[PDB]
Design a protein around this ligand. Structure first.
Ligand SMILES: CC(=O)O[C@H]1C(=O)[C@@]2(C)[C@H]([C@H](OC(=O)c3ccccc3)[C@]3(O)C[C@H](OC(=O)[C@H](O)[C@@H](NC(=O)c4ccccc4)c4ccccc4)C(C)=C1C3(C)C)[C@]1(OC(C)=O)CO[C@@H]1C[C@@H]2O
Ligand SMILES: Nc1nc2c(ncn2[C@@H]2O[C@H](COP(=O)(O)OP(=O)(O)OP(=O)(O)O)[C@@H](O)[C@H]2O)c(=O)[nH]1
Ligand SMILES: Nc1nc2c(ncn2[C@@H]2O[C@H](COP(=O)(O)OP(=O)(O)O)[C@@H](O)[C@H]2O)c(=O)[nH]1
Ligand SMILES: Nc1ncnc2c1ncn2[C@@H]1O[C@H](COP(=O)(O)OP(=O)(O)O)[C@@H](O)[C@H]1O
Ligand SMILES: [Mg+2]
Ligand SMILES: [Mg+2]
Lengths: 426, 280, 412
């Protein structure tokens, strides 16, 4: 039931750094410290994301793959940065250019060999291997390129293990890069044909959630990441704890992926109230449903209201009765029957853990698989095709070893993905 | 549209098989196109294009394909013949055949060269665990896939050799057949007419790729039949069908032969084989 | 005479823990006794580990606690084929060692959760081998039928249609409990919006206590397991009877403890107390086993049944003259020290087979058909050593269960 995290690229590393800051507190594990856990329930399944080596130094099982020293060199020189073993650091002093081809065909291809070695050392650790989780962004070289090539090999070495991926899709409103859509289109192609679970995170939706659902005036990267980190813990770690109704990657995927295509999900948080003021503690149960099932609160840019639902995964974590949970869940599917699919009687897959995230009393991780994600991929196709027509920065790709058909493959594939979702929307 | 021609072939009971039980004739025959299933119970109907009795050897069966194989060069498009059935039902017998009794494959090259400026290339590969292997030359794993700028997929790094002699063609494919003696076997030959180009593919059917491919095929034939009969295609889901897309989605004749045992114990197997091909 | 129990699946383990707790509680057996007579099987360590760490931890033996270090998977196929097959050996081994150790057994009490992984798959293959190795015994399974609208798993129906298809011709008596109807009962006949799984399971564990436990305890009208399979199923088909409890009153709000036979027996015929969403909308009774326990007078019983037999509102099937198996036990019911149960000095455990099951089945068959039409999560089953065959053959089978329950009744 163990897993190995992979933080490819600058973004992926930053995300991982914040993710490990959270998870550690959610298991009472200090950088060089051991199990300081306030409780004893955070020790029964630690193995899943840690490794027993010394006896006090529980090293997290993650991999840092990036071609920019500076980036990785800021992750290791910070707080929890000294928790990762040197062997886990897979850096490539080559050209960390923001080019997909440069990080997939030339500079990225060379470092692959140094990754495969580590991924095997981590897979053949102990117990049973569940899968590999990848964190990255579709707006960079090492992220969209290197991160997607690494997984392509993983899914060939271990076609049994599932592959959970957290991708920071290019935010619509404002792109953090110019080539962004190019790198995205190329990465999404391989992704949709490798991973078995993908959680789309959107920079513009993230900002929003930190500005309207959180009175935060200055939502920095750390903040944004912190929000996501809370979701991935409810996804992964959570399922590694006891509960009246527990689940796991397998149970989740076997109920979340209706079609081999892979299908993209959208992370949502339940208790999202501002600290001081907002602290009403109104989280009995329907308040969580109200939140999670609302447009605003969705980490993705697209809104659920713009597309039917295919799958719903409400992973609760806190002492509660299966009656107040199941009842509420059902009611929502009866009230909003309009967008909740017809060929599936009950899309919602209820899950209820026991131990909540340390300081919280009641929580619930939301995972939605709606066809609304069409209003995201469509954007990408548009952005891509619009600049592809003129072959904008094609010289940066072709010059680093690429093919004219590589773009057609990616575009076609991803464009077909948009279509597929629509085939079920109606 | 060109619906796959379904031909049903019933092989004679094996020495040990017949000795075990004289179940031969479990399937009843009504019309040349249809078969009725009556097993001592279950009653079903299998509708095909044509069927040959259990007494019919490979000789009588290959002749039907002969006319279809030689005509392909004239067609100017791709052609594919799929052999489906239970192991030992006669698939290999129908494809390559025995030394004494040649199958559909040997006769095809014999007739093609007989008519043979015409250029013909030969390719023989097997797919195992979604990986392609070149049966043609013994030294040797991944194979690669090439896609044209238009989006048309083609097999890359496949060993293609021109054949000057008729026996040479059969012998060259035999080399690969020797290797594989579980997986899918596919023999592809490109005919150049001077340019009118045809492609003859002899496919011997048989892991996650097998159960998937079988289902995807059933999904594609269903989706296709729907589109053809009345006012999404699963080809992308599976690489096997995707590479053959040009032939399927394009204008081309698709012949499918279903070989099975007339045995009553094999009835459960038989229904599945015939179900993959066609129903009523 | 004895009866081992096979609790499989996440839910099956939780329901087993609750039932087993109550069991020892009414037998004067604290955590440290003697040795029980059941086993727990699941594909998730944490599920079995909860009992290996929680209460009554040392009340069991590591030999009767089998777990599969791999993955559970919420799909029948995987739990049946892929993984399930691997574990069957070890599991069967235990159910054969305990069967020999005991002295003249009667059968095996199965406990599973229709719409699950190990609860669906595992059980299917387990009972398959059991009905062959121990065909000369009683095969009673206690299943937890997926709530009609309050589903858990998304694939839920798929897992229940495949488990019934393989168990229908292998089970003798399949008791079914509706999860949705349990929520309602705790809402109306207990009044509480905080009924956790451990509370729901306690209800079932009470009914089951009167099923197995009590039956093994002498009384004025002892009832064996054989008697059940004989009086409950008129046809080889593993017909699914319903579970009903009489004293389902709260030990805080309402206070009516002293509830004469006439009242407690009648409280079982109402759909608002049958632990099943199989309301008597048309389902005619064909066989009912009234299991009484506590201070009950045979004459009073033989009067409550009489008045009902002449009520007509409980319309029985035509071919059924008298379908009331009277079971009178001595041992009164047993309420948990700190639960929510009133505690009466008598209970009416009503179980029966009614055409009502045709409803529930219809709605579940519908689910299967609807989803199957678009294949949905079929690839998760297919890629686990499965195909359209077994699927379609399970659709056809269930169809003959819709016809069965329709032919066994509705007409004279
Ligand atoms: C006094 C008190 O009760 O403080 C709360 C608090 O005020 C609130 C506002 C917290 C607070 O969270 C944020 O302000 C926040 C900041 C950046 C991004 C996202 C959120 C809190 O910081 C977060 C913190 O969360 C946890 O402790 C969880 O275990 C959480 N942990 C982390 O995210 C984490 C933070 C720093 C270091 C390590 C871990 C978690 C959630 C899911 C899965 C695993 C862990 C909590 C309850 C609080 C504070 C401390 C103020 C809230 O968030 C969470 C994730 O619980 C924001 O809305 C909720 C409601 C809480 O009541
Ligand atoms: N009464 C009762 N029902 C339960 C309990 N636990 C789960 N269920 C129900 O049983 C079904 C859940 O099955 P799961 O827990 O998902 O799975 P499982 O059968 O244990 O096996 P896996 O799928 O392999 O994990 C749902 O319909 C739940 O409502 C319980 O403790 N009591
Ligand atoms: N949430 C989030 N996004 C980030 C972070 N860093 C970069 N990004 C996003 O990632 C994209 C840029 O890709 P980048 O990570 O620099 O690529 P790479 O470093 O070359 O692999 C932009 O869309 C950014 O908004 C981060 O720490 N958190
Ligand atoms: N129609 C037939 N007439 C005579 N022999 C046959 C016929 N079909 C099959 N056989 C023989 O029966 C055996 C099984 O045939 P084969 O084609 O190898 O089975 P499969 O390829 O389906 O596993 C072979 O020895 C083959 O020569
Ligand atoms: Mg053969
Ligand atoms: Mg379980």
């Amino acid at each position: 039931r163990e897993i190995v995290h992979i933080q490819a690229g600058q973004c992926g590393n930053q995300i991982g750094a914040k993710f490990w800051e959270v998870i550690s507190d959610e298991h009472g594990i200090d950088p060089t410290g051991s199990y300081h856990g306030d409780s004893d329930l955070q020790l029964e399944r630690i193995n899943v994301y840690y490794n027993e080596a010394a006896g006090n130094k529980y090293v997290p099982r993650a991999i840092l793959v990036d071609l920019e020293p500076g980036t990785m060199d800021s992750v290791r020189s910070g707080p929890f940065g000294q928790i990762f073993r040197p062997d886990n650091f897979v850096f490539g002093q080559s050209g960390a250019g923001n080019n997909w081809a440069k990080g997939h065909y030339t500079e990225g291809a060379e470092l692959v060999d140094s990754v495969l070695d580590v991924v095997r050392k981590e897979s053949e650790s102990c117990d049973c291997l569940q899968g590999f989780q990848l964190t990255h962004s579709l707006g960079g070289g090492t992220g969209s390129g290197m991160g997607t090539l690494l997984i392509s090999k993983i899914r060939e070495e271990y076609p049994d293990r599932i592959m959970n991926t957290f991708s920071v899709v290019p935010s619509p409103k404002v792109s953090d890069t110019v080539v962004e859509p190019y790198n995205a289109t190329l990465s999404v192609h391989q992704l949709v044909e490798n991973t078995d679970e993908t959680y789309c995170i959107d920079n513009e939706a993230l900002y929003d959630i930190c500005f309207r659902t959180l009175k935060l005036t200055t939502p920095t990267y750390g903040d944004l990441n912190h929000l996501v980190s809370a979701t991935m813990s409810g996804v992964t770690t959570c399922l590694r704890f006891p509960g009246q109704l527990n689940a796991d990657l397998r149970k989740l995927a076997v109920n979340m992926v209706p079609f081999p295509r892979l299908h993209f999900f959208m992370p949502g948080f339940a208790p999202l109230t501002s600290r001081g003021s907002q602290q009403y503690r109104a989280l009995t149960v329907p308040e969580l449903t109200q939140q999670m099932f609302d447009a605003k609160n969705m980490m993705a840019a697209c809104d659920p209201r713009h597309g039917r639902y295919l799958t719903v995964a409400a992973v609760f974590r806190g002492r509660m009765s299966m009656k107040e949970v199941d009842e509420q869940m059902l009611n929502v599917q009866n009230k909003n029957s309009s967008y909740f699919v017809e060929w599936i009687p009950n899309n919602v897959k209820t899950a209820v853990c026991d131990i909540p995230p340390r300081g919280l009393k009641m929580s619930a991780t939301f995972i939605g698989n709606s066809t609304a994600i069409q209003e995201l991929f469509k954007r990408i196709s548009e952005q891509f095709t619009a600049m592809f027509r003129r072959k904008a920065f094609l010289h940066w790709y072709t010059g680093e070893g690429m093919d004219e058909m590589e773009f057609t493959e990616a575009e076609s594939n991803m464009n077909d993905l948009v279509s597929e979702y629509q085939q079920y929307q109606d | 549209s060109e619906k796959v021609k379904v031909y049903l072939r019933i092989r004679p009971f094996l020495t040990s098989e017949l000795d075990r039980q004289e179940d031969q004739g479990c399937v009843c025959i009504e019309n040349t196109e249809t078969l009725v299933l009556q097993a001592p119970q279950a009653t079903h109907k299998f509708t095909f294009s044509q069927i040959f009795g259990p007494e019919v050897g490979q000789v009588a069966f290959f002749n039907l394909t002969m006319k279809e194989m030689v005509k392909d060069v004239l067609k100017g498009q791709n052609w594919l013949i799929y052999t489906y059935g239970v192991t030992n039902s006669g698939k290999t017998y129908t494809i390559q055949g025995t030394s004494k009794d040649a199958g559909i494959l040997p006769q095809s090259l014999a007739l093609i060269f007989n008519s043979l400026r015409f250029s013909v290339w030969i390719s023989f590969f097997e797919i195992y665990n979604e990986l392609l292997y070149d049966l043609l030359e013994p030294p040797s794993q991944t194979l690669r896939l090439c896609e044209d700028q238009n989006g048309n997929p083609y097999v890359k790094d496949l060993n293609w050799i021109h054949v000057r002699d008729v026996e040479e063609a059969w012998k060259l494919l035999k080399v690969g057949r020797k290797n594989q003696s579980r997986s899918h076997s596919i023999f592809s030959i490109r005919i150049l007419h001077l340019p009118k180009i045809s492609e003859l593919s002899l496919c011997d059917l048989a892991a996650g790729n097998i159960n998937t491919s079988l289902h995807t095929l059933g999904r594609c034939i269903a989706a296709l039949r729907q589109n053809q009969q009345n006012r999404l295609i699963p080809f992308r889901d599976s690489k096997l069908t995707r590479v053959f897309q040009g032939f399927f989605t394009g204008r081309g004749r698709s012949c499918m032969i279903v070989n099975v045992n007339p045995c009553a114990s094999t009835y459960d197997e038989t229904l599945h084989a015939a179900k993959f091909s066609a129903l009523a | 005479r004895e009866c081992i129990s096979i609790h499989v699946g996440q839910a099956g383990v939780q329901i087993g823990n609750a039932c087993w707790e109550l069991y020892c509680l009414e037998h004067g057996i604290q955590p440290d006794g003697h040795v029980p007579r059941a086993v727990f099987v699941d594909l998730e360590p944490t599920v079995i580990d909860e009992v290996r760490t929680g209460t009554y931890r040392q009340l069991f033996h590591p030999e009767q606690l089998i777990t599969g270090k791999e993955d559970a998977a919420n799909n029948y196929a995987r739990g049946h084929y892929t993984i399930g097959k691997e574990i069957i050996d070890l599991v069967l081994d235990r159910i054969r060692k305990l069967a020999d150790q005991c002295t003249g057994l009667q059968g095996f009490s199965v406990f599973h959760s229709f719409g699950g992984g190990t609860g669906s798959g595992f059980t299917s293959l387990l009972m398959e081998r059991l009905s062959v190795d121990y065909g000369k015994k009683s095969k009673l399974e206690f299943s937890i039928y997926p709530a009609p609208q309050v589903s858990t798993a998304v694939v839920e129906p798929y897992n229940s249609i495949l488990t019934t298809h393989t168990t229908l011709e292998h089970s003798d008596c399949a008791f079914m409990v509706d999860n949705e109807a349990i929520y309602d009962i705790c809402r109306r006949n207990l009044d509480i919006e905080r009924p956790t799984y451990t509370n729901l399971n306690r209800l079932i564990g009470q009914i089951v206590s009167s099923i197995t436990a009590s039956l093994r305890f002498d009384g004025a009208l002892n009832v064996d397991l054989t008697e059940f399979q004989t009086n409950l199923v008129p046809y080889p088909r593993g017909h699914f009877p319903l579970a009903t409890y009489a004293p389902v009153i709260s030990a805080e709000k309402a206070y009516h403890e002293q509830l004469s036979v006439a009242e407690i027996t009648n409280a079982c015929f109402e759909p608002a107390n049958q632990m099943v969403k199989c309301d008597p909308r048309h389902g005619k009774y064909m066989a009912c086993c009234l299991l009484y326990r506590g201070d009950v007078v045979p004459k009073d019983v033989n009067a409550a049944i009489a008045t009902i037999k002449t009520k007509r509102t409980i319309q029985f099937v035509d071919w059924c003259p008298t379908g009331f198996k009277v079971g009178i036990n001595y041992e009164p019911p047993t309420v948990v020290p700190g639960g929510d149960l009133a505690k009466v000095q008598r209970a009416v455990c009503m179980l029966s087979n009614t055409t009502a099951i045709a409803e529930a089945w219809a709605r579940l068959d519908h689910k299967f058909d609807l989803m199957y039409a678009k294949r949905a999560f079929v690839h998760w089953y297919v890629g686990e050593g499965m195909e359209e065959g077994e699927f379609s053959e399970a659709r056809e089978d269930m169809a003959a269960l819709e016809k069965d329950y329709e032919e066994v009744g509705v007409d004279s």
